[PDB]
Amino acid sequence: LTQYVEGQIVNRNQLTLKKQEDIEQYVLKLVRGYFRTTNKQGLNINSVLQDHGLDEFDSIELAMQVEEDLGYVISAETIPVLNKVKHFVNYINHVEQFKAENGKAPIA
Amino acid sequence: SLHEKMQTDYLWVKDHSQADSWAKARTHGYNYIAHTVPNKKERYEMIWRSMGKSTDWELEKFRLGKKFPDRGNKRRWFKNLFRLIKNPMGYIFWKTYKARLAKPSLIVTSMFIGFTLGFIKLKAQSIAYSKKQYATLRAGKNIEGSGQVHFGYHDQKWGMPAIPMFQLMYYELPGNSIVVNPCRNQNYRLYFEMRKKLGI
Amino acid sequence: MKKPMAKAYEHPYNSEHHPLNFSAVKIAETFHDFIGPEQVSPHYESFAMSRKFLLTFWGGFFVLNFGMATVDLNWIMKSTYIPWIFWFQLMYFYVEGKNSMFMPLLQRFYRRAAANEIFTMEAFYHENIENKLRNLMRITKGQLEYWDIHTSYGEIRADSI
Amino acid sequence: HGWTSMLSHAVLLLSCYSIIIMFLFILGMPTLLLYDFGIFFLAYLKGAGK
Amino acid sequence: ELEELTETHNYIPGAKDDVNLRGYLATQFAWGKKVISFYRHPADDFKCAKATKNMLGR
Amino acid sequence: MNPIQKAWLKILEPVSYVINEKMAKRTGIIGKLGRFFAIGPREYGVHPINRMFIFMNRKYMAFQAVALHRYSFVKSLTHNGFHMLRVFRHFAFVLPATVLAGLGLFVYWGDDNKCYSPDRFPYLKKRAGDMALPLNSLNQ
Amino acid sequence: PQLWPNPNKLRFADLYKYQGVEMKKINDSIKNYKAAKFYIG
Amino acid sequence: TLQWGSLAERPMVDRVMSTSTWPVPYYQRLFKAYPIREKKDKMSLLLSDIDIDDTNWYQAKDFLRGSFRGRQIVDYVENNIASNTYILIQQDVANMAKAYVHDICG
Amino acid sequence: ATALYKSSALAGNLFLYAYNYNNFTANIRLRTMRYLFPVVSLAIFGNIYWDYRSQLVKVNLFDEYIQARAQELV
Amino acid sequence: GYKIRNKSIFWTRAGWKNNWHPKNFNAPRPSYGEFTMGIRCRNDHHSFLRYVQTYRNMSRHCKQYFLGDKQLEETFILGLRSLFLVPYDSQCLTDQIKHGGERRFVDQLDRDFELISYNTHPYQLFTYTVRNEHLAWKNEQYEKIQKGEKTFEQELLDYLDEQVLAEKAKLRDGQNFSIERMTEIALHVFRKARAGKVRPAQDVRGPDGNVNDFLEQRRPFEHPNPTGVTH
Ligand SMILES: CCCCCCCCCCCCCCCCCC(=O)OC[C@H](COP(=O)([O-])OCC(O)COP(=O)([O-])OC[C@@H](COC(=O)CCCCCCCCCCCCCCCCC)OC(=O)CCCCCCCCCCCCCCCCC)OC(=O)CCCCCCCCCCCCCCCCC
Ligand SMILES: CCCCCCCCCCCCCCCCCC(=O)OC[C@H](COP(=O)([O-])OCC(O)COP(=O)([O-])OC[C@@H](COC(=O)CCCCCCCCCCCCCCCCC)OC(=O)CCCCCCCCCCCCCCCCC)OC(=O)CCCCCCCCCCCCCCCCC
Ligand SMILES: CCCCCCCCCCCCCCCCCC(=O)OC[C@H](COP(=O)([O-])OCC(O)COP(=O)([O-])OC[C@@H](COC(=O)CCCCCCCCCCCCCCCCC)OC(=O)CCCCCCCCCCCCCCCCC)OC(=O)CCCCCCCCCCCCCCCCC
Ligand SMILES: CCCCCCCCCCCCCCCCCC(=O)OC[C@H](COP(=O)([O-])OCC(O)COP(=O)([O-])OC[C@@H](COC(=O)CCCCCCCCCCCCCCCCC)OC(=O)CCCCCCCCCCCCCCCCC)OC(=O)CCCCCCCCCCCCCCCCC
Ligand SMILES: CCCCCCCCCCCCCCCCCC(=O)OC[C@H](COP(=O)([O-])OCC(O)COP(=O)([O-])OC[C@@H](COC(=O)CCCCCCCCCCCCCCCCC)OC(=O)CCCCCCCCCCCCCCCCC)OC(=O)CCCCCCCCCCCCCCCCC
Ligand SMILES: CCCCCCCCCCCCCCCCCC(=O)OC[C@H](COP(=O)([O-])OCC[N+](C)(C)C)OC(=O)CCCCCCCCCCCCCCCCC
Ligand SMILES: COC1=C(OC)C(=O)C(C/C=C(\C)CC/C=C(\C)CC/C=C(\C)CC/C=C(\C)CC/C=C(\C)CC/C=C(/C)CC/C=C(\C)CCC=C(C)C)=C(C)C1=O
């Protein structure tokens, strides 16, 4: 549960959003933090990642960071469909709703 | 760098003679002359120019002065012999680099190695035959002449021609295949029976 | 200045004298340590031509040494006759006969001609790479012209008023 | 084979073994190919029956 | 990069080079003039085999 | 410079003082003799035999890495991993087995190391002073 | 820079504690010898 | 020519001097000696003719962030510039001229 | 002398592995040597020690027989 | 310079500069369903998702040994993308490769990740060495700045700033200080500084045609026997 951060071991924390407004604010902060993202302030809920300097491989790095913060296990079949900010928000809702009903994480 | 002077001195040998420290003994190039190079006559002109500048083109001074050998070439054959013993493969590699720039075909290289190793193989058999003649001499047969190329009325055996035809039909006698008969091991039956008789 | 990291990861099974992975470069380094540096002669004449008489003595000494030692030298000469005739008549065409008979077999020449051209390309490496940069530098200089125009707008706006 | 003249008492030792190696592994190439075809291997060779 | 070609057993010269210019210089007069295909590994084998109604899979 | 050369220095420390400080600068012949047998860093002190091993070890190891790094014959039998048609899969373990057999290259060198030499004919010639004997000497 | 070791102008104590590129290779080989104690053992 | 002399004097014909010195050392140097495998302070010569790419703006930010003015430039560009890439290429003066007519009205 | 040479040659293999420990251990391309080096080394030691041990038993049987048989003939 | 003169240099039996589908006898041919009994083929439609998972594996398994170095992670990402963007930008028509270019590259990248998972890939060992040499130099600068001392890089920057003032104060006729003139000022200082350092000889030949090595000592012979160590 611990990771190196600039040569120092730091305890990593996990997030539990469970709310639509918390999901949108997290995803926006997630994409803005990525070093390849352009026009960070022009980024809105309906922003296409291709319009901000992101390609299919940058979506993998973004999804890899979601598994770090939220603790998800996202399969490789789902990653290539995450091409908008809206897609990350709807996917996070689908995972939390799936775990609230099925009592287990989605298939990985 | 830091370890350059130490490592360069450790890797290679330098010249310890101070032959050229003496001014008048320095050669003009007339001691070891190249005879067949295409610029041969340009070498002689430079030697003549060196002799003329030393005497201000009054060569009578050279005739009256003493002539010296090339002291820088002293003990050069010994120095190459010591480098050959120090690193034989490194000496051979660099002395043959210019010659090995032209590489003959795989066929020619194989012919060189084949005939060379084949000649050494015949030499080894010739040495072994000399030991046979020494054993024959000690066994009581005096030997006139030498070798196995019988001049008289005897059969000769020339040695296997180093071509695949004879190398498929014949092969040399391997001495390690001549063994003591395994019936020798049956004498150990005497030991097993003796041990039981003695209650061992 | 922010304090940087103390060090990166240090691999426990990789060293300079014992590199973990293999290539011809490390083998080339150990090869030249073995054969040593290029044995540069400092003299005015080569060693063979200066000692022709002496090397001829030692050349014939070992010939006589082998000749005096080999008492059955005639048996070796006769034993070598058959393979000498056989291998030379068999490989004559592939070595020499092809140069004036049925087929040239220029495969080995094609390898010399390609390598001779690469020798020239390496000799002109600095020239060819410098011409390629002249076009990239031209593109870079063209993009830097927009900043030169902008730096004069403040002077233009002031002089226009 | 000239460089192997002193490696044994037979100059053609490596050639005599290689001709057997060449025979065995070439003989096994068709056998492994039929194994790759599977149980249908006969249909790959002759085709459909009549 | 030379160690990467060796450790992955990509020992076909010029396989990962987009323009194997050395491969073209070596085959200027070769029979069946061809250069290695891009990123060809010496171990991969894409051979197939089919059984048809005719012989030899035709 | 190696530990064996440094061990010689501590033993020859007083000898180096007599040669380098006293003899190497006294005068005349004693000076020339002391400057010739001076003690210090070995000029041309590299050991080519050490270097011959390092080169040949590295070159033979790169060959071991290639011959031992093969795709498995067993894994290709099911046609479910990476190999559908491999008509020469039965050659996959020849090079690995050949490199592993090279470990006994020096252990079994010559005839004496592959058998019990006293039961062979060549042993009798060595005990006879490397002398030729009749081929049936082991029987008589 | 000017204090770099010279094979001619060298002290006895400096040569004994030189520790050059030859020793750096050996120290790497020694690390392999020590790490192989359990395997060889 | 193809007739250069005897075999013993073959290594003699190779040397070509740039000075007038006599006698001339015959040996023609083949390579440069490389006794110590030292890591060169020189940058790699592979970085020769690579076109513009992502490493140019990534290193520009790293060197700009070493200054106070550069830190302001980087922050404003990555936040308040509507561009789909950091590889900025000026192919027209549309954004420049329209920024001047919207400014000189005062 | 044979048993001593083959023991020194086997010791040479252990040095070859130790001198190249990092490559034989960390490089997966040499995994087969790392795995099967101890199996081959045990077989080599097995042959060396088997030959020495069997030779030693045969010498003891010979020595004890010539002494027992000599006393009977006396 | 020198240009290839053979106009047919890039000609192959399959076309100009064709390194995607070389011409061979056993050419691919179609299969007809109604006439095919059985088939043995290894091709599938799994390369796309395998390409995505391989990128995630190579990225995440390499970041294990970065010690949280954020700049190194971002630099490694740029390098990792350059490895995966090869088939998308190459001159070679990767979509026309003989037996499926997608499968070929995915299997090729899997061999790289296998080495990466063991932390033995040469790109990894090269990254640790390059980063250690870089951080050692950054730590040297940090220790000099904490001590109030001026770094060698700041001395040149300060020295180059006063050179531009001196040149633009004497160049009053023209007032266009181009980047060409700015460059040759720095290069004149860089050459003088590089020649000042005690560096190993990089060029083959010095001012004369002779080589700059320790082996380039010819006659005249003027060196005595080597002297021993002093006590
Ligand atoms: C009363 C009681 C006492 C009685 C005493 C009686 C005796 C009197 C004693 C004194 C006698 C001499 C008088 C003084 C002479 C001074 C002359 C001089 O100024 O120096 C010239 C000469 C100049 O040499 P240099 O100019 O520096 O270099 C030579 C050239 O540059 C060339 O260098 P290079 O590199 O080109 O090599 C070529 C060289 C040599 O190159 C060679 O090829 C020779 C190879 C020889 C070694 C190999 C031998 C083969 C067998 C062994 C194999 C080796 C294998 C190694 C490799 C392993 C296998 C791969 O060619 C030479 O032969 C040079 C020799 C000197 C020239 C003389 C004319 C030579 C023609 C005759 C040739 C036949 C003899 C050759 C002997 C060579 C000995 C060095 O220096 C000497 O000769 C030094 C000799 C003085 C030594 C004094 C030792 C103490 C004296 C007392 C000893 C007590 C002995 C008791 C005996 C008891 C009775 C049995
Ligand atoms: C010898 C004269 C009589 C003696 C009197 C002394 C005369 C004073 C001079 C003596 C001093 C120099 C001695 C000659 C040296 C050669 C001359 C030279 O340097 O020229 C540069 C020469 C470059 O040649 P190039 O003419 O500039 O261009 C050639 C082109 O590549 C392609 O050229 P190409 O396309 O036009 O033709 C291909 C081929 C031309 O085709 C051939 O050369 C045919 C070669 C076929 C095989 C011949 C085997 C020789 C027999 C040896 C077997 C033992 C002898 C006893 C048994 C037989 C009895 C007859 O090229 C060549 O090989 C050129 C060499 C031709 C002349 C030299 C041939 C000598 C053969 C001996 C003649 C008979 C001697 C009887 C022995 C007498 C003893 C009492 O250097 C060479 O590389 C060629 C030499 C042979 C190298 C082959 C590769 C050997 C690699 C061995 C690797 C294994 C070693 C392991 C290391 C060992 C442990 C550390
Ligand atoms: C899918 C396609 C097929 C698969 C392709 C994959 C092949 C991979 C190739 C990779 C190359 C190997 C890489 C490593 C080699 C590097 C070292 C080297 O040897 O290069 C030589 C290197 C290159 O030579 P080169 O001068 O450039 O000439 C190159 C070629 O010859 C070209 O020059 P050329 O055009 O002027 O040659 C004309 C040619 C003209 O030849 C012809 O026109 C017709 C030839 C018909 C042959 C007739 C056979 C008769 C059989 C009768 C047998 C009776 C006795 C049998 C007894 C057995 C028991 C009953 O005649 C020759 O001179 C041929 C040269 C000797 C050939 C020896 C092997 C022949 C059979 C090859 C088996 C492969 C078959 C593949 C299937 C191909 C089907 C199309 O030169 C050197 O010698 C330097 C290296 C020093 C070597 C000396 C010691 C050699 C021993 C150690 C070598 C290394 C270990 C062994 C490896 C294999 C060697 C045999
Ligand atoms: C001196 C030496 C001489 C010989 C030299 C060579 C030595 C031999 C080595 C060669 C290789 C042998 C190793 C084979 C490994 C096989 C492993 C395996 O079992 O995997 C299964 C595998 C089959 O799976 P698959 O093909 O991948 O796909 C199957 C489908 O998924 C399935 O689709 P499906 O479900 O629609 O199919 C339905 C079913 C249909 O099956 C049927 O046809 C049914 C048959 C009728 C059953 C009885 C019905 C009874 C009805 C009763 C009714 C009761 C109900 C009554 C009413 C109810 C009452 C209330 O098919 C099957 O499932 C059966 C396939 C497997 C059959 C077994 C084939 C291997 C038998 C080998 C026997 C001998 C082995 C000795 C080896 C000893 C070890 C050394 O077997 C094979 O692949 C066989 C390949 C054979 C190729 C090699 C042939 C080489 C040629 C040899 C002769 C060369 C002569 C010339 C020599 C020249 C000099 C060299
Ligand atoms: C009680 C103790 C404690 C127990 C509990 C703890 C221990 C538990 C187990 C621990 C681990 C054990 C390790 C093994 C299990 C590993 C499981 C696994 O998943 O690994 C997968 C593993 C994964 O692959 P990889 O990691 O990528 O690479 C694996 C290897 O690097 C190499 O992979 P590869 O695929 O490349 O290897 C291929 C090689 C593998 O090597 C072998 O397995 C040797 C095979 C020799 C036998 C071949 C049988 C042929 C058909 C015979 C049919 C009848 C059988 C009757 C036998 C009767 C015997 C008298 O086989 C071949 O070379 C195939 C070609 C053979 C040439 C042609 C010969 C066939 C035709 C013969 C015709 C002659 C007769 C004709 C007439 C017949 C009469 C009518 O693959 C393996 O199989 C690993 C094998 C490792 C070697 C293990 C043994 C080391 C040596 C130990 C001492 C000797 C013991 C074995 C002796 C066997 C009898 C000779
Ligand atoms: C030297 C010591 C080591 C020796 C190792 C062997 C070295 C071999 C060197 C490489 C030569 C390989 C020749 C391959 C064929 C090249 C010619 C060609 O491509 O044909 C094009 C030819 C020629 O077309 P072309 O256009 O290229 O040439 C035209 C010719 N002229 C110019 C004269 C008009 O076209 C064909 O398609 C014919 C195909 C015939 C196939 C013949 C080869 C079949 C055998 C190859 C497989 C062998 C595998 C053996 C493996 C054994 C394993 C157990
Ligand atoms: C394991 O994988 C493998 C490799 O690694 C990848 C290989 O490199 C290789 C290739 C092998 C090589 C490159 C090695 C080749 C070596 C060969 C052929 C033989 C070497 C022979 C010599 C160097 C000659 C040395 C001469 C002698 C031993 C005779 C004189 C006796 C001497 C000098 C020793 C005296 C005897 C003793 C018992 C005392 C021992 C002395 C010491 C231990 C002193 C050491 C002192 C210190 C301070 C270390 C293989 C085959 C391999 O399988």
The DSSP annotation for C84-115 comes to HHHHHHHSHHHHTGGGTSS---THHHHHHHHH
Question: Which ranges of D1-50 would DSSP assign to H, the alpha helix?
Answer: 13-37, 41-45
Cis bond leading into J207, ω under 30°?
A: no
The two beta strands, J11-12 and J15-16, are antiparallel
* Residue located via tokens 């500084």: J193
Q: Which of E3, C72, J103, C133 is nearest to B147 (CA)?
A: C72
DSSP E51: E
A11 sits in which H/E element? strand A8-11
d(CA C3, CA A8): 13
- Answer yes or no: is J45 a known binding residue: yes
d(CA E25, CA C111): 9
What is the phi-psi region of residue J119: left when phi exceeds 0, alpha when psi lies from -120 to 50, beta otherwise? left
d(CA E52, CA J33): 9
d(CA F88, CA D29): 6
Q: Taking a C-beta distance cutoff of 8 angstroms, is the pair H13, H25 a contact?
A: no
Q: Taking a C-beta distance cutoff of 8 angstroms, is the pair I29, F65 a contact?
A: yes
- B148-178 b/e (C-beta count within 10 Å ≥ 16 → b): bbeeeeeeeeebbbbeeeebeeeeeeebbeb
How much of chain E is helix, strand and coil, in % rounded to 5?
A: 25, 5, 65
Q: Taking a C-beta distance cutoff of 8 angstroms, is the pair A80, A7 a contact?
A: no
The Cα-based distances of E36 to B197, E1, E18, J92 in angstroms read: 80, 19, 11, 12
J108 CA to centre of ligand 5 in angstroms: 28
3-state secondary structure chain J: CCCCCCCCCCEECCEECCCCCCCCCCCCCCCCHHHEEEEECCCCCCHHHHHHHHHHHHHHHHHHHCCCCHHHHHHHHHHHHHHHCHHHHCCCCHHHCCCCHHHHHHHHHHHHHHHHHCCCCHHHHHHHHHHHHHHHHHHHHHHHHHCCCCCHHHHHHHHHHHHHHHHHHHCCCCCCCCHHHHHHHHHHHHHHHHHHCCCCCCCCECCCCCECCCCCCCCCCCCCCCCCCEC
3-state secondary structure H42-103: CCCCCCCCCCCCHHHHHHHHHHHCCCHHHHHHHHHHHHCCCCCCCCCCCCCCHHHHHHHHCC
The gap between the terminal CA atoms of chain F, to the nearest Å, is 59
What are the tokens at J197? 């350092």
Query: What count of Cα atoms within 13 Å lies in the side-chain half-sphere of residue J175?
Result: 2
Q: Taking a C-beta distance cutoff of 8 angstroms, is the pair F54, C30 a contact?
A: yes
Set of chain B residues whose Cβ sits within 8 Å of the Cβ of I69: 194
Q: A2-10, long-range: CB within 8 Å, 24+ apart, which pairs?
A: A3/J68, A4/J66, A4/J67, A4/J68, A5/J68, A6/C5, A6/J67, A6/J68, A6/J69, A6/J70, A7/C5, A7/C6, A7/J67, A7/J68, A7/J69, A8/J68, A10/J68
Q: How many CB atoms lie within 10 A of CB C14?
A: 21
**Which chains reach chain I with 3 or more Cβ–Cβ distances below 8 angstroms?**
B, C, F, G, J
What are the tokens at D34? 């039929």
Amino acid at F48: P
Q: Taking a C-beta distance cutoff of 8 angstroms, is the pair J70, A6 a contact?
A: yes
**Which chains reach chain E with 3 or more Cβ–Cβ distances below 8 angstroms?**
C, D, F, J
d(CA I65, CA B196): 12
Q: Cα G6 vs. chain centroid, distance in angstroms? A: 17
What are the tokens at J155? 């001395």
Q: Taking a C-beta distance cutoff of 8 angstroms, is the pair J66, J76 a contact?
A: yes
Q: Rounded to the nearest 10 degrees, what angle do helices B188-197 and I31-73 cross at?
A: 60
Q: Is A57 exposed, middle or buried (0-12, 13-18, 19+ CB in 10 A)?
A: buried
Q: Cα H87 vs. chain centroid, distance in angstroms? A: 19
J192 CA to centre of ligand 5 in angstroms: 68
Name the binding residues of F for ubiquinone-8: 57, 64
The gap between the terminal CA atoms of chain D, to the nearest Å, is 53
Nearest to E38 among J40, J92, J115 (CB): J92
Q: Which of I1, A62, J134 is nearest to F117 (CA)?
A: I1
Does ligand 4 have an atom closer than 6 angstroms to the CB of D2? no
Q: Taking a C-beta distance cutoff of 8 angstroms, is the pair B6, J211 a contact?
A: no
Dihedral pair phi/psi, residue J129, rounded to 5°: -70, -45
Compute the nearest-CA separation of F15 from chain G (Å). 12
Enumerate residues 6+ apart whose C-beta is below 8 A from A106.
A75, A94, A95, A98, A99
Q: Which of J89, J122, J118 is nearest to J105 (CA)?
A: J89
Q: Cα J178 vs. chain centroid, distance in angstroms? A: 30
Q: Taking a C-beta distance cutoff of 8 angstroms, is the pair A24, A86 a contact?
A: no
What are the tokens at J110? 């899997």
Q: How many CB atoms lie within 10 A of CB I23?
A: 26
The gap between the terminal CA atoms of chain G, to the nearest Å, is 46
Query: What count of Cα atoms within 13 Å lies in the side-chain half-sphere of residue J173?
Result: 0
Give the 3-state secondary structure of residue F88: coil
d(CA J150, CA J143): 10
Q: Rounded to the nearest 10 degrees, what angle do helices C24-35 and F48-68 cross at?
A: 160
Check CB contact under 8 Å for C16 and G28: yes
DSSP E5: H
Q: Which of B9, B78, H12, G4 is nearest to C37 (CA)?
A: B9
What are the tokens at J123? 């790109």
The Cα-based distances of E7 to A108, C23, C157, E22 in angstroms read: 32, 9, 64, 22
Dihedral pair phi/psi, residue A3, rounded to 5°: -140, 160
d(CA C2, CA A7): 14
Give the length of chain A: 108
Query: What count of Cα atoms within 13 Å lies in the side-chain half-sphere of residue H72?
Result: 2
Give the 3-state secondary structure of residue G37: helix
d(CA I64, CA B196): 13
Q: How many CB atoms lie within 10 A of CB F24?
A: 22
What is the phi-psi region of residue B28: left when phi exceeds 0, alpha when psi lies from -120 to 50, beta otherwise? alpha
B76 CA to centre of ligand 1 in angstroms: 14
Cis bond leading into J220, ω under 30°?
A: yes
d(CA J152, CA J162): 16
Check CB contact under 8 Å for I68 and B198: yes
Q: Which of A69, A70, A64, A62 is nearest to A105 (CA)?
A: A70
Q: Give the CA diameter of chain I.
A: 71
What are the tokens at H72? 């302001």
Q: Rounded to the nearest 10 degrees, what angle do helices H68-79 and H54-64 cross at?
A: 140
Set of chain E residues whose Cβ sits within 8 Å of the Cβ of C118: 22, 25
Set of chain D residues whose Cβ sits within 8 Å of the Cβ of B177: none
Does ligand 7 have an atom closer than 6 angstroms to the CB of F63? no
d(CA G18, CA B2): 11
Give the 3-state secondary structure of residue A5: strand
- D16-45 b/e (C-beta count within 10 Å ≥ 16 → b): eeeeeeeeeeeebeeebbeebbeeeeebbe
Q: Is B133 exposed, middle or buried (0-12, 13-18, 19+ CB in 10 A)?
A: middle
What are the tokens at G16? 């004994």
A3 sits in which H/E element? strand A2-5
Chain breaks in chain G (C to N over 2.5 A) after: none
* Residue located via tokens 């040659």: I9
Q: Is D50 exposed, middle or buried (0-12, 13-18, 19+ CB in 10 A)?
A: exposed
Residues B45, B50, B56, B59, CA torsion sign: negative
d(CA C27, CA A35): 41
Q: Hey, whose CA ends up nearest to atom 54 of ligand 1?
A: B81
Q: How is chain B classified by DSSP, letter by letter?
A: -TTHHHHHHHHS------GGGSSTT---S-SS--SSSTTHHHHHHHHHHHHHHHTTT-THHHHHSPP---GGGTTHHHHHHHHHHHSHHHHHHHHTTTGGGSPPPHHHHHHHHHHHHHHHHHHHHHHHHHHHHHHHHHTT----S-SS--SSS--------SSHHHHHH-----GGG-B--GGGGGGHHHHHHHHHHTT-
Chain breaks in chain C (C to N over 2.5 A) after: none
d(CA A5, CA G1): 39
Give the 3-state secondary structure of residue D4: helix
Angle (CA) J66-J68-J74 rounded to 5° is: 75
Give the 3-state secondary structure of residue E52: strand
Residues A76, A81, A83, A86, CA torsion sign: negative
DSSP F101: H
d(CA J18, CA J13): 8
Check CB contact under 8 Å for C20 and I25: no
Q: Taking a C-beta distance cutoff of 8 angstroms, is the pair F35, F43 a contact?
A: no
d(CA H15, CA C46): 12
d(CA B101, CA J163): 53
d(CA C59, CA C61): 6
d(CA A23, CA A15): 10
Q: Taking a C-beta distance cutoff of 8 angstroms, is the pair C10, J128 a contact?
A: yes
Q: Taking a C-beta distance cutoff of 8 angstroms, is the pair I61, F127 a contact?
A: no
Nearest to G8 among J198, J226, J231 (CB): J226
Set of chain J residues whose Cβ sits within 8 Å of the Cβ of D38: 38, 40
Question: Which ranges of F69-111 would DSSP assign to H, the alpha helix?
Answer: 94-101
- B87-107 b/e (C-beta count within 10 Å ≥ 16 → b): beebbebbbeeeeeeeeeeee
* Residue located via tokens 């035959």: B129
The Cα-based distances of F97 to A63, E51, F21, I25 in angstroms read: 46, 37, 62, 19
User: CA gyration radius for chain G?
Assistant: 16
Angle (CA) C60-C66-C71 rounded to 5° is: 130
What are the tokens at E5? 């070609």
